[PDB]
Amino acid sequence: MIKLIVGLGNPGAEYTATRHNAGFWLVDQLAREAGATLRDERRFHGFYAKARLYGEEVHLLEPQTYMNRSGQSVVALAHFFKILPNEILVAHDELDLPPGAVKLKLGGGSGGHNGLKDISAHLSSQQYWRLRIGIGHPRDMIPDVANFVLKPPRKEEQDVIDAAIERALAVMPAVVKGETERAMMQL
């Protein structure tokens, strides 16, 4: 049963529409849906809310550390509330899935993602859940990943990513209740 949902991204107005902020998009929309207000919480190095989701108390977090320091934020909260990696869901952009795909997975390595790398380092564990939001890969369109994720999705990509995030929001009841197989079937 998930007690913390983290969305990954970079801080500041300039980064808000970039692919690397896909996780923030999901958590922003989840917060709105739940009537929760994300507020700056210095203890957790990011924006934070204690949300009521489908009858459960669930912490929501968007680290404001820059992507590669996201672990400082996650571990501060996890240690404070005594949350285990298996009770954490991290929503992030996934290069290895196409735009419009979303998947739920426990563990699986970082896939080169610097936010995941830092979270796994600070938790001393990769064994947290991920909501992998497909953004595609820069090789896909050919007959530099660092700069690819710092651009917004193309309009046609954004449309299918938005619909995938909606599908992910719709499986949150199953995620927060620990109904993994249900969530995967629906997703």
Swiss-Prot record:
EC code(s) of this entry: 3.1.1.29
Site entry (Stabilizes the basic form of H active site to accept a proton), positions: D93
Compartmental location: Cytoplasm
Gene Ontology annotations of biological process type: protein quality control for misfolded or incompletely synthesized proteins; rescue of stalled ribosome
Active site: H20
Assigned keywords, A-Z: Cytoplasm, Hydrolase, RNA-binding, tRNA-binding
One function term, GO molecular function aspect: peptidyl-tRNA hydrolase activity
Observed phenotype of the null mutant: Essential, it cannot be deleted.
Top-level lineage group: Bacteria
Classification via Pfam families: Pept_tRNA_hydro
Catalysed reaction equations from the record: an N-acyl-L-alpha-aminoacyl-tRNA + H2O = an N-acyl-L-amino acid + a tRNA + H(+)
Family the entry assigns: Belongs to the PTH family.
Biological role: Hydrolyzes ribosome-free peptidyl-tRNAs (with 1 or more amino acids incorporated), which drop off the ribosome during protein synthesis, or as a result of ribosome stalling. Catalyzes the release of premature peptidyl moieties from peptidyl-tRNA molecules trapped in stalled 50S ribosomal subunits, and thus maintains levels of free tRNAs and 50S ribosomes.
Protein name: Peptidyl-tRNA hydrolase
Residues under site feature: Discriminates between blocked and unblocked aminoacyl-tRNA: N10
Residues at which tRNA binds: Y15, Y66, N68, N114
